[PDB]
Symmetry: D2
Amino acid sequence: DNNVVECIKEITESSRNGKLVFFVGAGVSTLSDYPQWWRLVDKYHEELYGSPYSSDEYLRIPQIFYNVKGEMAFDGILKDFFQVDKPTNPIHDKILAMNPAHVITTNYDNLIDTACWKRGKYFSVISAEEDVANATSSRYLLKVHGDFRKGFKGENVVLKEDDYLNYDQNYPLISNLMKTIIATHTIVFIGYGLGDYNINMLLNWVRKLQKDSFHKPFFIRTDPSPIENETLIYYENKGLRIIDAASLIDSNEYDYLERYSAVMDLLIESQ
Amino acid sequence: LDNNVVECIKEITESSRNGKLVFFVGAGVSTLSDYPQWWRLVDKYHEELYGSPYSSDEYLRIPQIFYNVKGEMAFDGILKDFFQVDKPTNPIHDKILAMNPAHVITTNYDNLIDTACWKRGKYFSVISAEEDVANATSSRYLLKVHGDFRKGFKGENVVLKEDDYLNYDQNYPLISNLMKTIIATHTIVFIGYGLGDYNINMLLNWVRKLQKDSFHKPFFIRTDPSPIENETLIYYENKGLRIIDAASLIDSNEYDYLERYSAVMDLLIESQENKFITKDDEVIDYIYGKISPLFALQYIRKIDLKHVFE
Amino acid sequence: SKRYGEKLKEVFLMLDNNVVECIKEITESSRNGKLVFFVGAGVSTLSDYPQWWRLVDKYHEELYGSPYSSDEYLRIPQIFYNVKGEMAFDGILKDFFQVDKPTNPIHDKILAMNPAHVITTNYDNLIDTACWKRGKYFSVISAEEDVANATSSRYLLKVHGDFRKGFKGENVVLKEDDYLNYDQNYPLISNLMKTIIATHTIVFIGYGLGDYNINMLLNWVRKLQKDSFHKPFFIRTDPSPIENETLIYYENKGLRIIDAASLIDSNEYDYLERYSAVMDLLIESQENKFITKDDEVIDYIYGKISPLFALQYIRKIDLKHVFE
Amino acid sequence: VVECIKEITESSRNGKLVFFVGAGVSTLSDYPQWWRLVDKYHEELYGSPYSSDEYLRIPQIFYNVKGEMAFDGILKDFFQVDKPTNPIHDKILAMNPAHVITTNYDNLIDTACWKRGKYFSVISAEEDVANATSSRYLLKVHGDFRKGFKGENVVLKEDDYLNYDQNYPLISNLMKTIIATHTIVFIGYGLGDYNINMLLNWVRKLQKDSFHKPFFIRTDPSPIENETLIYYENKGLRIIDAASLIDSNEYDYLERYSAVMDLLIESQ
């Protein structure tokens, strides 16, 4: 399609200019069989009531466990679930081969960190409040939701309902830096859904901005069904340029890896 | 019943006697009157937007998409053809009114509470728009925080779509301020809510910002078919709620919500005259509560003592 | 006394139409019981309560050894609080404010206007004492916890705290930190103030047009829907008459200004006379000292009697209650 | 002071230095101050010629009662002047700042950058943030008159500072990001300035140690009192006072600015 062709043209232009920034979601980590959050909520529910989900439950049940079962058990469950070493899927390699100026990720894993270490491109990893000031390099691997580098504790990561409720207060520098990077760069979203919490919050923040004062970020959709035209136009009017990998080619209902690979290697071959 | 349940009943009835009881009525009470639920409206919006038929955020986003795409006129038409119905008032409406509440705050955009107030003989200043706050004719309000269809069956008169909830504080500053003031200054009982409702959690989030003990914990009449889990009960009671579970009080069928609501409502009403006196200590406590203020006076006329004990 | 009454009558006779309508609206609110008074520091000053500029003077004296913009009045107390301790701040508060001052006649006039509520930025107990003498009970709300347990329907809402608990800097809104964190620290107080403003008729007395509280309230008012609220009345008692440009600017912001200096002639430092001019105009409007022609008599008696046309017979003992 | 110079010079060598230039340097360049603008607005308002909010309220009153046309006319007839750049601008450029944040709406810093040959991406509107083509930034947080001598292009009166975050979210975000990620030296600002107070209020929201303490060059004629100094050290500002460094005249601000600028430059 002409719109799609213009899209990959503009991401290739931004990548050549060095103004390209990649926004990484949970799908990229899940592609490497990382422990998903739904199973963490399932374990919290099993330790809460003994028998194992809406959008609100995903944030509430961890908060219920944190409140009634304390924080030591929360940290123990997080440690036993997330203290794993997983190989980097080719999607990380293709993202880094696109030469992104910044990598803003909501994932709390170190997959992007090890991928960057292997690829030889040094990214200043900023995941805590103190990391903003003492940034060694210009390129930022910005984990807006924190990570487990300090330790496998829930205080370092944005997981529960309280963490999302108080994110602006607890992470003013991280949120400010991420908004600045979005404003002054071209943003490409992978590993996210159209109904994702962070995606819709970012759409709200964009709606607060002045019209035509920002570049519309790119959203890459790997949902199995092709994107509905009504949903597509609704989200494009909200400030998104959607590249649907499901519309690009036909694939199975469970093969997400090839779906990400289609857009990634199409972008690379355009470059 | 349980001791804490009896304490909740005592507090609610004392507030009702003092004229400081406010009822926060949700969609559950209207649903028992067969008023169309919002999931049918989202079903229709999905039917028009897509081929054929959700998440909690979808219930607001799908109408938002229908608005943004098909037009305010189409949204208006579907709202008009779905909500322009006449439904009877529940006995629960009459029970709430018989509790003599100071105010009735409600997220219901129907006039079922209005019809109940008009039938029973209660005069409430119905505040459903911003201009109604200053034009209220009395100090007792029927506060529809999400608007209604009195002006017309228009989508701008109510809080339905996603954009309505995001811009609620901006679009309803007087109504929101009045609701929070009523919550702060009165005793609040939540009825018709599912303990996971958006409004309940927004009010609990606002309650978090308040001082540690500057507010009274609102009551929550939970009428879910199954008894509340203990961990959920601790979580919500540590958030500032005092939960009275209809399922724990009596046993009934899963789909028999009318009896679940009526158990708690009739237990509250029948407790209005009840003094909860069984032991001699309770007798002494009640008589002391009646008599101790008279210790200031040197003598009391014996014919005046009939007024002390009502 | 009689000369003052005659002068007030004359002033009402040549009063501007706008001021006459404002007075009529305020009196109608008073009769309806929907009148709320927003009392400022000026009314407390009329009884010679210690003003805040002397407190800033003492703070500057202890800070730099020598004896003010708008920011200074809030920063210098904050300078004292940060550089020195809280104990010294509370001690200065105690020595300046632990005084028993009388209630000026303006207090009596305000309570004679039958206010449903009295909001005030004054941390003194002058208004509480004034309400106590007149036999009407006002639930005094000066802290967060006081909001939930409010005994009566009428509130005396001290939005900046007071010293009933003690002469401490944590009980009152004085320094710059208090104003920065007022919304966080006083959610219930601010919400109750805004609800009272929305639901009642507000008259600002004792305030300057450029006061911080007035500007904050006008900033909140701008957020409200157009024509969804009633414009508060503002009794301006500055020595000089209000400029036309300032008047139109503040009336477009949602204020109905009754300027005392424009109504009567008075000395520059005769503040009590300026306050009394407007308050007495309101009261003698309530007391019907200003009706003289047979048309006003008919309208007054009709307003008292026309509702009784609904009934068939009215007891002569009831007619006494009808005419108060 | 010696330690303060070491940090400034070290960060200047690292290339992450940023200067927050106030109205003081523009005044040193004899630019029309805002107080005379307020005086002109008052004269055209009341007819006879100040509180902290007066500087914001009086232009707002004039805009409300007279209209946008008269406001912009006064702005144009008072600001459309050519003023040579003072040597302090050249010294600031010679410190090689990574970015220059200015509350000034003039082109004095822009003209200095053009004269010296340094390319800074001048941002004063919302659209300038996204379309900036250089890593270096000249962030005019209050706007300027490059588009035109209009009141909408600048933040001058009340209802412009009140709605600053609503109309300048991108610019405010960029300013805060630059402050967080770089070291900041305030020059041409008073300690009681509104912008300094706003930035200190925002900094108080940040958690402890997460931010670099901004540097404040004070050029008032009288030496700072120890109590006010310690108060503003606690607030987060590291203050270097020109009055304490050398003995200077009451109205000789240029030598006061130079006593800090040349000392900082020669310590490279």
